Amino acid sequence: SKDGYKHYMLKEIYEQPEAVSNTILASLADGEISLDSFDKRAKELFEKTKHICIVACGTSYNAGMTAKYWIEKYAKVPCSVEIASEIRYRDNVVVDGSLFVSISQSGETADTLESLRKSKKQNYVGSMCICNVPNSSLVRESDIAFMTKAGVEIGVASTKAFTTQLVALAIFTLVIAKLKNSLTDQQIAKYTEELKNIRALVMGALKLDTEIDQISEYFSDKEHTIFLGRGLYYPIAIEGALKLKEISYIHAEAYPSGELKHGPLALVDKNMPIVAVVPNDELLDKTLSNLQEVHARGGKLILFVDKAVKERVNFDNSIVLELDAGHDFSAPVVFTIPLQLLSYHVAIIKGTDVDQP
Amino acid sequence: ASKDGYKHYMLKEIYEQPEAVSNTILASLADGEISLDSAKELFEKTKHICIVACGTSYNAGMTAKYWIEKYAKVPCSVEIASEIRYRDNVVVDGSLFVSISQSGETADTLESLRKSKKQNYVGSMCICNVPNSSLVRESDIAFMTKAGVEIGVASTKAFTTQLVALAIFTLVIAKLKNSLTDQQIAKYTEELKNIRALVMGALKLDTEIDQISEYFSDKEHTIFLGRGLYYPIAIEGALKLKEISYIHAEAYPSGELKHGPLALVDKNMPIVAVVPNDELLDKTLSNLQEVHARGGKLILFVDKAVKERVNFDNSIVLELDAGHDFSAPVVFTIPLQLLSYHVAIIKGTDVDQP
């Protein structure tokens, strides 16, 4: 069933508030993030963890990249993130006390699954899967499984699997943080409340649907797009580009906003759409400065901006949609939504398939 | 200011690469051998290596990572300087901060080094080309490339010499940590020395590549493919083509077409791929097959020892002897540099800085 939506992909984008909130709920006990909701081996395994090794592919790899910022900053555990089809065949070294974390919607992704199998002959303390399908090879073969509650996906692009993977990784960050005393019980509580507030913010984000539909006409004759973000939002930009590419077949590519200097300024002219995410954080002034460079070349700026910075965002002839995105934990998820909607509508404009067979 | 008889500074710089490579090795040899007298204190304390850089130097770092983990067996991470600079990061115990930069003045990289002094690194090392640069001055050890001066728009000899310095570093650290036998150090040392002739063999393709570049005249996209070591080499290729021809060139790890990158392939789409003589040939060949079935125009730079297994109707194949893990990454970069130069000339774009 599409539940009245025009396409399954659009239904799934609209299930995200429920999905996000179901994922959080499953790890709570009395509204607090609880270690008791995890498998009971989990704690011993986390006490031994000194390094976290995230392996995944595609959208799940983009989630992992986002999570590394959170893990290092809040849990203070070093984190590396690697593409499964590369680590699988590479002759790598495993830090002592390394936890192997895989991320997968289906739990059957070949390269990820085979990276897990290889890891069992290496120096890891153990494995954890962030997965959506219980009773999948990845869940069975890992020591512990944190389950997302995304339900099933028929959209060509994954939507709710990505946001729920982000939320699971945020919850994991706080569990680790607490166990290793990286955060006070009061910080844990403040960031837990921020995760709970995601549902309302995601729903707000979904309000931009109609305006994003109107904007998407701009893309009908376009064969390139550039996505921009910094920090946590770089991987969010990469995920946005992946959706656009995957279902509209536009050559969409993401760049960390600080790196335009060398490569991508060259590509920007007056026919080039630039989609950027401009959050309420420490790096606003850098980002506005990077955006200026791009504006200077005639790029068509399409900006999704947190309401708290919109007054500071002024570019002649840009398009600016504003929203409340919250802080470090919520904003990466919230800003994803517009990008999913963008890719949905541009796909319709191009007449490409949004749903799978 | 001399073009040395070449038509452009960039062409000249491409052709200085044999000299620059060999000069970079020389400055780190002692009687043709990797010795430490040519600091040993830090490397002893180093348990993890953190490479920080941007653009081309970052792509050199990404290649070196494969080497360092495989041969030196030291865990290594590479990060883009403008991100690590502002990120709340955690430093593993025993981490060596390694920066890479031609000028030694790159703001993001320089500030990352300054930030690192307040963190838990055992010390720093530069891989730099300008002695008396902030990065040289402020690092504990410097490993000098001998790239001379660049005036081309795209960096050519900065990149190859950075790779060679990083290979040398790998072997130094490997010896000191006893990760390889003296006989393996000797053999890989010979491999680096052999680069000069292999790079000269590659420069002979200049004319053929000129004929090929004809294909790119009306193209606005290109995809670059590589696996393992050769993925960052593909990224470097893409960076050059984009930077000087303004084509929308993008590199992908050949294992990850199985997402969107396959959707972008049609029959008017050049696919530039590096095909080395390594264990991954079978999977690279499968990857190329799928790209081929969707109408991609394959353009393949291929090691001679595997050219017999490369058979695609309507593809363009240039073969060369590229050697093994240390030399081939540097050898395969040469044709991609040459490609971007010629394509730029075909697009009427500029190859040289004013």
From Swiss-Prot, chain A:
Domain SIS: from-to ranges: 42-182, 215-357
Cysteine disulfide partners in this protein: none
Location of the protein in the cell: Cytoplasm
Keyword Transferase attached: yes
Top-rank EC class of the record's enzyme: transferase
GO terms, molecular function: carbohydrate derivative binding; glutamine-fructose-6-phosphate transaminase (isomerizing) activity
Enzyme Commission number(s) from the entry: 2.6.1.16
Keywords attached to this entry: Aminotransferase, Cytoplasm, Glutamine amidotransferase, Repeat, Transferase
GO BP term, pick one: protein N-linked glycosylation
Annotated Gene Ontology cellular component terms: cytosol
Catalytic reaction equation(s): D-fructose 6-phosphate + L-glutamine = D-glucosamine 6-phosphate + L-glutamate
Assembly and interaction partners: Homodimer.
Function: Catalyzes the first step in hexosamine metabolism, converting fructose-6P into glucosamine-6P using glutamine as a nitrogen source.
Official protein name in the record: Glutamine--fructose-6-phosphate aminotransferase [isomerizing]
Range of the intact protein held here: 246 to 602 of 612
